[PDB]
Design a protein around this motif. Structure first.
Motif, PDB file in Angstrom:
ATOM      1  N   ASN A   1       0.814  -1.212   0.000  1.00 13.63           N
ATOM      2  CA  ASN A   1       0.000   0.000   0.000  1.00 13.63           C
ATOM      3  C   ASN A   1       0.849   1.263   0.000  1.00 13.63           C
ATOM      4  O   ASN A   1       1.507   1.582   0.988  1.00 13.63           O
ATOM      5  CB  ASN A   1      -0.954   0.013   1.193  1.00 13.63           C
ATOM      6  N   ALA A   2       0.821   1.991  -1.106  1.00 15.29           N
ATOM      7  CA  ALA A   2       1.613   3.208  -1.222  1.00 15.29           C
ATOM      8  C   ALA A   2       1.181   4.322  -0.265  1.00 15.29           C
ATOM      9  O   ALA A   2       1.944   5.257  -0.019  1.00 15.29           O
ATOM     10  CB  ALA A   2       1.617   3.708  -2.665  1.00 15.29           C
ATOM     11  N   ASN A   3      -0.024   4.215   0.294  1.00 16.14           N
ATOM     12  CA  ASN A   3      -0.613   5.334   1.038  1.00 16.14           C
ATOM     13  C   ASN A   3      -1.180   4.965   2.405  1.00 16.14           C
ATOM     14  O   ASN A   3      -2.395   4.906   2.590  1.00 16.14           O
ATOM     15  CB  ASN A   3      -1.698   5.999   0.191  1.00 16.14           C
ATOM     16  N   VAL A   4      -0.293   4.736   3.365  1.00 14.78           N
ATOM     17  CA  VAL A   4      -0.687   4.329   4.706  1.00 14.78           C
ATOM     18  C   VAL A   4      -0.670   5.530   5.652  1.00 14.78           C
ATOM     19  O   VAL A   4      -1.442   5.590   6.608  1.00 14.78           O
ATOM     20  CB  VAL A   4       0.246   3.213   5.242  1.00 14.78           C
TER      21      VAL A   4
ATOM     22  N   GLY B   1      14.313   5.200   5.886  1.00 12.21           N
ATOM     23  CA  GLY B   1      13.462   6.371   5.970  1.00 12.21           C
ATOM     24  C   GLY B   1      13.742   7.457   4.946  1.00 12.21           C
ATOM     25  O   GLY B   1      14.644   7.346   4.113  1.00 12.21           O
ATOM     26  N   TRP B   2      12.941   8.515   5.010  1.00 13.20           N
ATOM     27  CA  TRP B   2      13.112   9.677   4.149  1.00 13.20           C
ATOM     28  C   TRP B   2      12.419  10.889   4.765  1.00 13.20           C
ATOM     29  O   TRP B   2      11.649  10.767   5.727  1.00 13.20           O
ATOM     30  CB  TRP B   2      12.567   9.405   2.741  1.00 13.20           C
ATOM     31  N   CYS B   3      12.711  12.062   4.212  1.00 11.01           N
ATOM     32  CA  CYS B   3      12.103  13.300   4.673  1.00 11.01           C
ATOM     33  C   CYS B   3      11.340  13.945   3.537  1.00 11.01           C
ATOM     34  O   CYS B   3      11.878  14.148   2.445  1.00 11.01           O
ATOM     35  CB  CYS B   3      13.164  14.262   5.195  1.00 11.01           C
TER      36      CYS B   3
ATOM     37  N   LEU C   1       3.107  17.834   0.175  1.00 10.28           N
ATOM     38  CA  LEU C   1       2.413  16.727   0.813  1.00 10.28           C
ATOM     39  C   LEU C   1       2.629  15.477  -0.027  1.00 10.28           C
ATOM     40  O   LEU C   1       2.605  15.526  -1.262  1.00 10.28           O
ATOM     41  CB  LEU C   1       0.922  17.023   0.982  1.00 10.28           C
ATOM     42  N   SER C   2       2.872  14.363   0.653  1.00 14.34           N
ATOM     43  CA  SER C   2       3.109  13.089  -0.001  1.00 14.34           C
ATOM     44  C   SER C   2       2.690  12.014   0.980  1.00 14.34           C
ATOM     45  O   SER C   2       2.069  12.314   2.002  1.00 14.34           O
ATOM     46  CB  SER C   2       4.588  12.940  -0.366  1.00 14.34           C
ATOM     47  N   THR C   3       3.032  10.765   0.683  1.00 15.89           N
ATOM     48  CA  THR C   3       2.641   9.656   1.545  1.00 15.89           C
ATOM     49  C   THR C   3       3.785   8.704   1.871  1.00 15.89           C
ATOM     50  O   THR C   3       4.778   8.626   1.145  1.00 15.89           O
ATOM     51  CB  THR C   3       1.541   8.816   0.899  1.00 15.89           C
TER      52      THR C   3
ATOM     53  N   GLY D   1       8.994  -3.903   4.477  1.00 11.34           N
ATOM     54  CA  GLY D   1       9.692  -2.684   4.128  1.00 11.34           C
ATOM     55  C   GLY D   1       8.836  -1.630   3.467  1.00 11.34           C
ATOM     56  O   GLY D   1       7.614  -1.606   3.623  1.00 11.34           O
ATOM     57  N   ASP D   2       9.502  -0.751   2.725  1.00  7.79           N
ATOM     58  CA  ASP D   2       8.850   0.374   2.076  1.00  7.79           C
ATOM     59  C   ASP D   2       7.889  -0.155   1.027  1.00  7.79           C
ATOM     60  O   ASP D   2       7.841  -1.355   0.778  1.00  7.79           O
ATOM     61  CB  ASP D   2       9.892   1.284   1.433  1.00  7.79           C
ATOM     62  N   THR D   3       7.136   0.744   0.409  1.00 10.20           N
ATOM     63  CA  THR D   3       6.068   0.359  -0.510  1.00 10.20           C
ATOM     64  C   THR D   3       6.474  -0.674  -1.558  1.00 10.20           C
ATOM     65  O   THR D   3       5.768  -1.653  -1.782  1.00 10.20           O
ATOM     66  CB  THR D   3       5.508   1.587  -1.243  1.00 10.20           C
ATOM     67  N   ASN D   4       7.605  -0.445  -2.211  1.00 13.57           N
ATOM     68  CA  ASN D   4       8.085  -1.364  -3.236  1.00 13.57           C
ATOM     69  C   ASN D   4       8.536  -2.710  -2.659  1.00 13.57           C
ATOM     70  O   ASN D   4       9.320  -2.759  -1.713  1.00 13.57           O
ATOM     71  CB  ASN D   4       9.223  -0.716  -4.038  1.00 13.57           C
TER      72      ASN D   4
HETATM   73  C1  LIG Z   1       4.916   7.044  -4.734  1.00 10.86           C
HETATM   74  C2  LIG Z   1       3.914   7.476  -3.705  1.00 10.86           C
HETATM   75  O1  LIG Z   1       2.739   7.654  -4.015  1.00 10.86           O
HETATM   76  N1  LIG Z   1       4.354   7.664  -2.466  1.00 10.86           N
HETATM   77  C3  LIG Z   1       5.640   7.159  -2.040  1.00 10.86           C
HETATM   78  C4  LIG Z   1       6.617   8.311  -1.815  1.00 10.86           C
HETATM   79  O2  LIG Z   1       6.815   9.079  -2.990  1.00 10.86           O
HETATM   80  C5  LIG Z   1       7.007  10.501  -3.225  1.00 10.86           C
HETATM   81  C6  LIG Z   1       8.457  10.914  -3.446  1.00 10.86           C
HETATM   82  O3  LIG Z   1       9.306  10.231  -2.552  1.00 10.86           O
HETATM   83  C7  LIG Z   1       8.859  10.622  -4.889  1.00 10.86           C
HETATM   84  O4  LIG Z   1      10.132  11.173  -5.152  1.00 10.86           O
HETATM   85  C8  LIG Z   1       7.845  11.191  -5.884  1.00 10.86           C
HETATM   86  C9  LIG Z   1       8.103  10.633  -7.281  1.00 10.86           C
HETATM   87  O5  LIG Z   1       9.315  11.147  -7.786  1.00 10.86           O
HETATM   88  O6  LIG Z   1       6.512  10.894  -5.505  1.00 10.86           O
HETATM   89  C10 LIG Z   1       6.210  11.351  -4.204  1.00 10.86           C
HETATM   90  O7  LIG Z   1       4.825  11.276  -3.944  1.00 10.86           O
HETATM   91  O8  LIG Z   1       7.845   7.786  -1.354  1.00 10.86           O
HETATM   92  C11 LIG Z   1       7.765   7.101  -0.120  1.00 10.86           C
HETATM   93  C12 LIG Z   1       9.166   6.627   0.251  1.00 10.86           C
HETATM   94  O9  LIG Z   1       9.675   5.890  -0.840  1.00 10.86           O
HETATM   95  C13 LIG Z   1       6.808   5.914  -0.212  1.00 10.86           C
HETATM   96  O10 LIG Z   1       6.643   5.343   1.070  1.00 10.86           O
HETATM   97  C14 LIG Z   1       5.453   6.331  -0.773  1.00 10.86           C
HETATM   98  O11 LIG Z   1       4.664   5.191  -1.061  1.00 10.86           O
END
Ligand SMILES: CC(=O)N[C@H]1[C@H](O[C@H]2[C@@H](O)[C@H](O)[C@@H](CO)O[C@H]2O)O[C@H](CO)[C@@H](O)[C@@H]1O
Ligand code: NI
Length: 176
Positions: free
Chosen positions: A42-45, A108-110, A115-117, A87-90
């Motif tokens: 799930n990319a969006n938790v 991790g990441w910052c 806004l992102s997920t 692990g991470d989404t992938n």
């Molecule tokens: C891909 C997504 O929907 N969310 C990701 C998240 O992605 C980010 C950003 O890191 C990425 O550089 C750009 C694409 O170039 O998309 C944004 O929305 O990255 C985090 C950490 O990898 C994931 O957990 C999340 O699913």
């Protein structure tokens, strides 16, 4: 900052998934390479933004019954165990799990000033521990463990939900 936007209980693998293999289960333990087929992704938790920094820890609650190339074989029944990655989404970025304690499964990441997920993934691969005359192996619903988010670099969850859980959907393995 951060918000929870996923589900608290998550099922790994398709309900009643059928996994067959043509290799000879000649020597045990034998790994069923089901790829990423038995997994949850799930990319969006959590949603995050504004310099927020987060990674993921993971924990497997199943008993350790051995290891395979340094990764724990977690036991399900006397006949079948699992190799587990969290692990991470992938799926490809999955960290091989060992032991029953919380382990860093995503460094991790910052997130910048957008806004992102933050997402996650879990996949497992069945392991044949003991032979079955029928050449068929069955497993019922079972709790696997959990993943939680790890705010770092000042960031903090606050009162936001941190942890989600995973259950293995029942499956059958066919020794073909
Ligand atoms: C891909 C997504 O929907 N969310 C990701 C998240 O992605 C980010 C950003 O890191 C990425 O550089 C750009 C694409 O170039 O998309 C944004 O929305 O990255 C985090 C950490 O990898 C994931 O957990 C999340 O699913
Ligand atoms: Ni081979």
């Amino acid at each position: 900052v951060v918000s929870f936007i996923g589900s608290t209980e998550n099922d790994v693998g398709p309900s009643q998934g059928s996994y067959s293999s043509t290799h000879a289960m000649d020597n045990l333990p034998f790994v069923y390479n089901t790829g990423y087929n038995i997994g949850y992704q799930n990319a969006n938790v959590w949603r995050i933004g504004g310099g927020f920094c987060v990674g993921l820890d993971g924990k497997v609650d199943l008993p350790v019954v051995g290891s395979l190339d340094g990764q724990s074989i977690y036991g399900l029944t006397e006949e079948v165990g699992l190799l587990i990655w969290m692990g991470d989404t992938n799926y490809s970025r999955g960290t091989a799990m060992s032991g029953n304690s919380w382990e860093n499964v995503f460094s991790g990441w910052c997130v910048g000033n957008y806004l992102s997920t933050q997402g996650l993934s879990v996949h497992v691969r069945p392991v044949i521990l003991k032979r079955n005359s029928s050449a068929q192996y069955s497993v019922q619903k079972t709790s696997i463990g959990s993943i939680r988010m790890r705010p770092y670099n000042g960031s903090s969850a606050g009162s936001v939900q941190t942890t989600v859980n995973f259950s293995l959907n029942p499956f059958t393995l066919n020794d073909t």
